């Protein structure tokens, strides 16, 4: 399980708050990445983790006249092209929904107008794991209809363990 040991080694060696703050942020991103990976594996969809909208548009519509559109500089985690619809996918791992709503608002305003100009039907979908209860919440109707049952086995304990080691080490 090489992801956990790399963090252990980093926590073993860290001696300053500055590097420690960095390790903490990394664990949280890694915890998000693990959810994204596990979720795509269970739902049997291609795993990606940050894709420029430019490359999404160029995948689903290789003949777009790109220079005619002002495409924003955003990287949603992943996407699904259904054949008829594009689902923008962002993963979230939080005990609450404030972070989910912030991304939802952002991608709604910056992504939907350009995709309407090009004529690709698009839905913003945000999938969030509660890392304590492992409950999964979904924002996005077409996603909901494509994946009615969503019981993805998850275990976030190792990430909580790594971070507790850190805050114990720096508890002063």
Binding-site ranges for Mn ion (CB under 5 A): 50, 77, 90-91
Instruction: Record the tokens describing residue 42, joined without a space.
Output: 């269970």
- Does 128 bind ligand 1I6 (CB under 6 A)? Our answer is no
HSE-up (13 A, CA, CB side) for residue 102: 6
73 among the known binding-site residues?
A: no
How many whole angstroms separate alpha carbon 75 and alpha carbon 93? 17
Window 10-69: residues binding ligand 1I6 (CB under 6 A):
28-29, 32, 50
Taking alpha carbons only, the member of 56, 54, 132, 143 closest to residue 91 is: 143
C-beta atoms surrounding 47 within 10 Å: 14
How many whole angstroms separate alpha carbon 75 and alpha carbon 142? 21
How many whole angstroms separate alpha carbon 133 and alpha carbon 127? 15
Closer CB to Mn ion, 86 or 90, in the complex: 90
Instruction: Record the tokens describing residue 28, joined without a space.
Output: 């949280």
Give the interface segment with ligand 1I6, choosing from 5-13, 88-96, 106-114, 153-161 (CB under 6 A): 88-96
77 among the known binding-site residues?
A: yes
CB 93 within 8 A of CB 58: no
* Least spacing, CB of residue 1 vs ligand 1I6, in Å: 20
91 among the known binding-site residues?
A: yes
Closer CB to Mn ion, 90 or 123, in the complex: 90
Phi, psi of 90 (to 5 degrees): -125, 135
Binder of residue 29, out of Mn ion, ligand 1I6, none (CB less than 5 to 8 A by kind): ligand 1I6
Binder of residue 74, out of ligand 1I6, Mn ion, none (CB less than 5 to 8 A by kind): ligand 1I6
Q: Detail the residues annotated as belonging to a binding site for Mn(2+).
A: 32, 50, 77, 90-91
Given the rule CB under 6 A, which residues bind ligand 1I6? 28-29, 32, 50, 73-75, 77, 90-92, 103
């Amino acid at each position: 399980d090489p992801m956990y040991e790399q963090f252990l080694q980093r926590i073993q060696a860290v001696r300053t708050a500055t590097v420690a703050k960095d390790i903490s942020a990394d664990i949280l991103e890694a915890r998000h990445d693990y959810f994204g990976r596990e979720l795509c594996r269970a739902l049997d969809i291609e795993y990606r983790n940050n894709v420029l909208l430019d490359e999404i548009i160029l995948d689903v519509y290789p003949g777009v006249n790109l220079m005619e559109y002002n495409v924003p500089h955003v990287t949603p985690d992943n996407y699904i092209w259904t054949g008829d619809m594009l689902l923008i996918l962002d993963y979230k791992v939080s005990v609450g929904h404030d972070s989910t709503e912030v991304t939802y608002k952002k991608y709604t305003t910056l992504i939907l107008p350009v995709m309407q100009e090009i004529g690709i039907n698009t839905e913003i979908c945000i999938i969030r794991a509660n890392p304590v209860t492992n409950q999964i919440s979904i924002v996005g109707e077409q996603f909901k209809r494509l994946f009615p049952t969503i019981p993805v086995e998850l275990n976030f304990a190792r990430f909580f363990e790594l971070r507790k080691m850190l805050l114990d080490k720096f508890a002063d």
